[PDB]
Amino acid sequence: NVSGVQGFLFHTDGKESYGYRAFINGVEIGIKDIETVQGFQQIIPSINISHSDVEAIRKAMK
Amino acid sequence: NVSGVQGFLFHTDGKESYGYRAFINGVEIGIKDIETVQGFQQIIPSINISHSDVEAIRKAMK
Amino acid sequence: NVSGVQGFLFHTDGKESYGYRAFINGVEIGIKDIETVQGFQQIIPSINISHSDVEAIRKAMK
Amino acid sequence: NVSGVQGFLFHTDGKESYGYRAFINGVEIGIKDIETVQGFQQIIPSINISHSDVEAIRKAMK
Amino acid sequence: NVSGVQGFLFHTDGKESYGYRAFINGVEIGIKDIETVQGFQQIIPSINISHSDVEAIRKAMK
Amino acid sequence: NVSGVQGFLFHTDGKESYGYRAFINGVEIGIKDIETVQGFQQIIPSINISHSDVEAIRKAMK
Amino acid sequence: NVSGVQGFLFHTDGKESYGYRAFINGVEIGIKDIETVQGFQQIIPSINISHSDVEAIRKAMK
Amino acid sequence: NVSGVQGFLFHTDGKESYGYRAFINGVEIGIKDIETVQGFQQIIPSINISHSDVEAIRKAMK
Numbered sequence: 001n002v003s004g005v006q007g008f009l010f011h012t013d014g015k016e017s018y019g020y021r022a023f024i025n026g027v028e029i030g031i032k033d034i035e036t037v038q039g040f041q042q043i044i045p046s047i048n049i050s051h052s053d054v055e056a057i058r059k060a061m062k
Numbered sequence: 063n064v065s066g067v068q069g070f071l072f073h074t075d076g077k078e079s080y081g082y083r084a085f086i087n088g089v090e091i092g093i094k095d096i097e098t099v100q101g102f103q104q105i106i107p108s109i110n111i112s113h114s115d116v117e118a119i120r121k122a123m124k
Numbered sequence: 125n126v127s128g129v130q131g132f133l134f135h136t137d138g139k140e141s142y143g144y145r146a147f148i149n150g151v152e153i154g155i156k157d158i159e160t161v162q163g164f165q166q167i168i169p170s171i172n173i174s175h176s177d178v179e180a181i182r183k184a185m186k
Numbered sequence: 187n188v189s190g191v192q193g194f195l196f197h198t199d200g201k202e203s204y205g206y207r208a209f210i211n212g213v214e215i216g217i218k219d220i221e222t223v224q225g226f227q228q229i230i231p232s233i234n235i236s237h238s239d240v241e242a243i244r245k246a247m248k
Numbered sequence: 249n250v251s252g253v254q255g256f257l258f259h260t261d262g263k264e265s266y267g268y269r270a271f272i273n274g275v276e277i278g279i280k281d282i283e284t285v286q287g288f289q290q291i292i293p294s295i296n297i298s299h300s301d302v303e304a305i306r307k308a309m310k
Numbered sequence: 311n312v313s314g315v316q317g318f319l320f321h322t323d324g325k326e327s328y329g330y331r332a333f334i335n336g337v338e339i340g341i342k343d344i345e346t347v348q349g350f351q352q353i354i355p356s357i358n359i360s361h362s363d364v365e366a367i368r369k370a371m372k
Numbered sequence: 373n374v375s376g377v378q379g380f381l382f383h384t385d386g387k388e389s390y391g392y393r394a395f396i397n398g399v400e401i402g403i404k405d406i407e408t409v410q411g412f413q414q415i416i417p418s419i420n421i422s423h424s425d426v427e428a429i430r431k432a433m434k
Numbered sequence: 435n436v437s438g439v440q441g442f443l444f445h446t447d448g449k450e451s452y453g454y455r456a457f458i459n460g461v462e463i464g465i466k467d468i469e470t471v472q473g474f475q476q477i478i479p480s481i482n483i484s485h486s487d488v489e490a491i492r493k494a495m496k
Contacts (some may be wrong), residue, residue: 003231004192004209004247008064008105011099014097023066024246033236036243042233043194045065047104051094057098060089062234068128070167076159085128103139109166112157119160122127122148130252132291140285147252169251171290174281181284183274185252189355190316190333190371213370219360221324222367228317228357254376262407271376292427293375295414298405305408309376309395313479314440314457314495334494343484346491347446357489362479374486378438380477386469395438419436419476422467430472432461 009037009046016051028048071099071108078113085123133170135160140175147185195223196231202237209247250274257285264299282294317346319356326361333371381409381418388423395433443471443480457495480491 007023009031018049020031021041035045049057069085071093082093084102093099099108111119133146133155134176144155146164155161161170192208196199205212206217208226217223223232255271256280270278271286279285285294291302317333319341330341332350341347345355359367379395381403396410403409404410409418411431441457443465454465456474465471472478483491 001064002187002189002192002229003064003194004212005194006064007246008065008067008222010101014095020117022246024243025248032238032244033200035198035234035236036229036239039196039234041209043064043231045105047101048080048097049101050097052094053098056091056093058088060069060084060086062089062090065126068126068133070127072163073174074159074185076157088128099171105126107167110159110163112159114156115160118153120149122131122146122151124149125250127250130250132251132253134287136283138281150252166274167250169291171287172283173287174283176280177284180277180279181272184270184272184276184277188311188313188316188353189318189319190336192358193370208370209348210367210370213372215366215370217366218362219324221360222360225320225357225359243313249374249399254374256375256377257424258411260406260407274376293415296407296411297405300404301408303404304397304401308379308394308399308401310397312435312437312440312477313442314460317494319492332494335493335496337493337494341490342486343448346487347444349444349482353479357485357493367471373436374435380437380439385466404441405463407467415436415440416484417477419473420469422469425465425470428463428465429458431457432441432458432463434461 004045005043009044010049010054010057011018012050013049014044016055018051020056026061028058028061065113066106067105069106069107072119074113074114075110076090076112079111080116088124090120090123095119127167129167131165131168133159133168134173134181136174136176137172140172142175142178151186152182189229189231193230195226195230196235196240196243197232198237199234202235202238206236208228214244214247251291253291255292257292258297258302258305259294260299261296262298266302267287270301274310276306276309315353317354319354320352320359320364321324322360323358324360328361329365336371338368338371348365375387375415379416382421382429383425384422385420386422390426392421396409398433400430400433411422437477437478441478443474443478444483444488444491445480446485447482448484452485452488460494460496462495
């Protein structure tokens, strides 16, 4: 993996969107623009996580 | 493995269901929503574990 | 190996069964239910070890 | 990966261009010349990042 | 290598047989039963080592 | 990678040549002879970097 | 590499034989029996080194 | 790479030959015999390095 990035994008398609976020090298960030989502989709996976589950996933990606 | 996640989802098809859970980077979490299960099934395996065996698996998975 | 598990299931088909056990990440456990055996067979190998040899294998997986 | 380089080029196709930049082994640099962009595109990925998201990516990429 | 085992079985086909033995994660053990030999042949290689050479191999294999 | 070398050759085809250089295992060197360039091109990549960008790349390969 | 062995067998076909030797996990040993040579040829490479060069190779495999 | 060797042979086809040499696990050695060159060409690459560039390569290869 030449990119130097490990992690994933996450979002929900449920009624209660939080937009897109990512874990990148163990750091959680918000992604504001569509362009950046598409850019990182070239190099890391993009999965669905419901709003109610984000807190637990945060615990495990710490 | 670009995702930065090692682990697995687990559930039982037996009578005493505990829903879905996962080990994610050595942290055990409960998973509240179907969308999250399907999200993580994109990047980690999903296996069956009896209610009766979770305690021993917990011991191995720190 | 995305599962975060290294190890193997072991059992004997000799007259003197000890059921199924596993080394998971260097930790020995007993597996009580058939469902759990089949689940872990999705991600780690499953080999035969006679009852008389388990003590030596324990020494080496310590 | 024989190059000894992990990282990526990034740029925006939006209105507020910042040219090309890169993370190379966790160091952020600006890239002044087209020849260098084309050189590094031989060994590292090249993705789109909005001007608005660079600050968060910076935080993840140390 | 998902098994968490690195090592090999060894035996001699010469006149002074010592049965089967193995190095498993740098620990030397004797193997008492055919079932165990066949089990481990599923996950580690099995080679020939003369009785006369075991002492030197021991020195290398710590 | 059996060669024990990670890095790359770099040069510019711009008007202002600095000849060939390389980062080899994090050490920057000049390559004076054509024979050596061709030799290392057998084992590491060879990319273009403009003279104006070498200073930044040096910073990141430190 | 599941064998837990890194190294090589070496011998000379020059007039001045030293028999077979090996570096196994950074430890030099002599191999006395043909059976052991053939056994290790299943898992590590077997190359030619002249008697006059063994001293230098020893220096580098230390 | 099962050999436990990382490195390369080097020589020059220029007028000032130094014979064959190698870096083997970060140690530079001279190689006295053709048989050894052919042996190591089985496990490590063999490249051209001008007499004039050896000093710089030495600096990188520690």
